[PDB]
Amino acid sequence: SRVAKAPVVVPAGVDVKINGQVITIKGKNGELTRTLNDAVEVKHADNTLTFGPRDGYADGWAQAGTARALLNSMVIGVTEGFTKKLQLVGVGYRAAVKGNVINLSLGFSHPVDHQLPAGITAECPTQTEIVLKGADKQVIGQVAADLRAYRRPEPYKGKGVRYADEVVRTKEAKKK
Amino acid sequence: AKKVQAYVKLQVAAGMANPSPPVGPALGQQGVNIMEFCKAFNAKTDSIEKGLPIPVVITVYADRSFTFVTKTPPAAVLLKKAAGIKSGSGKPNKDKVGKISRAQLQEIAQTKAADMTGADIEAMTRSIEGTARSMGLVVED
Amino acid sequence: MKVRASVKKLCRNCKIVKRDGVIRVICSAEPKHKQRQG
Amino acid sequence: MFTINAEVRKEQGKGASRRLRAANKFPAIIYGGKEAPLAIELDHDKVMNMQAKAEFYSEVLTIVVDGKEIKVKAQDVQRHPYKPKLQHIDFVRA
Amino acid sequence: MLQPKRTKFRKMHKGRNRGLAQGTDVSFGSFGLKAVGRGRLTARQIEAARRAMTRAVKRQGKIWIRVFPDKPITEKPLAVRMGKGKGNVEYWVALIQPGKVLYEMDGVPEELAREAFKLAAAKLPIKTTFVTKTVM
RNA sequence: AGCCAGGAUGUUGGCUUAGAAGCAGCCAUCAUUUAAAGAAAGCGUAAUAGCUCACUGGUCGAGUCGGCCUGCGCGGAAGA
Ligand SMILES: [Mg+2]
Ligand SMILES: [Mg+2]
Ligand SMILES: [Mg+2]
Ligand SMILES: [Mg+2]
DSSP, X not given: OXXXXXXXXXXXXXXXXXXXXXXXXXXXXXXXXXXXXXXXXXXXXTTEEEEXXXXXOTTHHHHHHHHHHHHHHHHHHHHHOEEEEEEEESTTOEEEEETTEEEXXXXXXXXXXXXXXXXXXXXXXXXXXXXXXXXXXXXXXXXXXXXXXXXXXXXXXXXXXXXXXXXXXXXXXXXX | OOOOSOBOOOOOOTTSOSOTTTTOTTSSXXXXXXXXXTTTGGGSSTXXXXXXXXXXXXXXXXXXXXXXXXXXXXXXXXXXXXXXXXXXXXXXTTSOOEEOOSSXXXXXXXXXXXXXXXXXXXXXXXXXXXXXXXXXXXXXO | OEEOSSOOOXXXXXXXXXXXXXXXXXXXXXXXXXXXXX | OXXXXXXXXXXXXXXXXXXXXXXXXXXXXXXXXXXXXXXXXXXXXXXXXXXXXXXXXXXEEEEESSSOEEEEEEXXXXXXXXXXXXXXXXXXXX | OOOXXXXXXXXXXXXXXXXXXXXXXXXXSSEEEEEOSOEEEEHHHHHHHHHHHHHHTTTOSEEEEOOOOOEEEEEOOTTOOSOSSOOEEEEEEEEEOTTOEEEEEESSOXXXXXXXXXXHHTTOSSOEEEEEOOOO
């Protein structure tokens, strides 16, 4: 609610289209569409979107705020675009990108081709560094956690695929 | 006054110059020397006196030795040879143990020409009163 | 994790959350703190 | 200074005083002086917070019943055995 | 452990524990641990808790115990018929009505009293509550 | 509540200290400069520590915190 009440501002020529509960938000860099709860009502005017409860729905505000904060980041999307970055730690751990595929070598018998979805793309300043880029905040999210999944950092060395935004506490080993 | 890059502090007395047993191997292990601790060390250690514990800077970048401008001795170093016991504590607060005073350690602390806080020398005056009390001493202030 | 009738914050970094119908403790600082079934 | 509102008691006995407490009120009494004692009902929530302050028991209180000002002092009190609540109070006209 | 040092008689009738309690006000210390429920305490129970509270205030303050056994409890053992005389005593208990002050304490910060009174409660078969001293 | 800052001086604190420099230990818990900064909050180094904290400046801009009396609910809940 502190969140929902707080307006969101559609910058330069970001075309916004509401069709009931069905928002579309296109700009410099893409186009995302979401469907809002139902107990959410969103008003478009000026160059701002606002959100507020809808008569006779308990969760009104909460639904509003989550909707609020979504559309906000939809807009950031088709505009500045998000970017997750992972780095690969451990002898032999390398990676790189044929088209919309990331070839990961993470110590298994078979290297790993990870298919990239709908609207994300990647490259690799380094053999050991991957960088996803896209408009959909919740999707570069997944992909990041998925490339991660192949080899979650281990706690005795940090060997493994990690977000760059990630601290990896390590520990000793038991005495004898 | 800049940031992190060279400084330790682990010694016994200006008396001993560079020793091996209480310290030794780690008195230089990164750009400092187990052998150089009478050169810049005694660049004014013996000139003046050898009988007061004192540590110092290290300042290290990549220039052979090191440029550690040296300075002051603690304030419980002057509770052995200027105030009372060589050891101290004992049973610190089972009774008054030892005892000092205001005259005792006024000039002995008023000296420092390279340390202490606040130009009022009635303040950094008493700043030292308590390092004779971290052992549990009586106040004849 | 540990599972028992009385679950509790153990560190200041513990957090209590409900998920599905189930009281859980998520500590951001000490895996041993993870509890379930409060 | 300590002002306590209170209407007098239409009925009496236990059935009546239990009902009283059933509906966040509780009964008390006033006595001493040459007057007949006066049976009363006080609102619970209000008198509760009053008495939480230890001047309640020291000072002379002023009980207001039917727009008349009775001056009194806390003389005794019965407390519910394990809940933080009053059961009954004795006020002394002084 | 508590228990009569001597008693006019050896065994008591089962009795019944109806009623509301007779010692209801912190009347020796600054804080009581009071019984919100009805039931029986055992010398071991009184004791296990007693230790718990004392543990928690190390050697500071003073403690009272407002309750006390005096009621002997029998039991027939395994493999015995019904009858053939009343059981053999085996422990003592104290009938508790709701509103008994159980323990009082005094000589500590209110907060620590709570802390101690807490830990002790954990050993008691009946729900309890932290009371304080009152003028009148 | 978040986030930008700071986190000090006797003092690397005397100490049954092999090394302790806040840390199982040591004993008290005082005392300087400041906006405030704990002989003490911590994951914890060979010891310096490197790094966030109790506490305080700024930013932000209106509510925020958890005890009391009570209704209905949740977990605690494994058998042929
Ligand atoms: Mg699930
Ligand atoms: Mg009846
Ligand atoms: Mg704030
Ligand atoms: Mg239940």
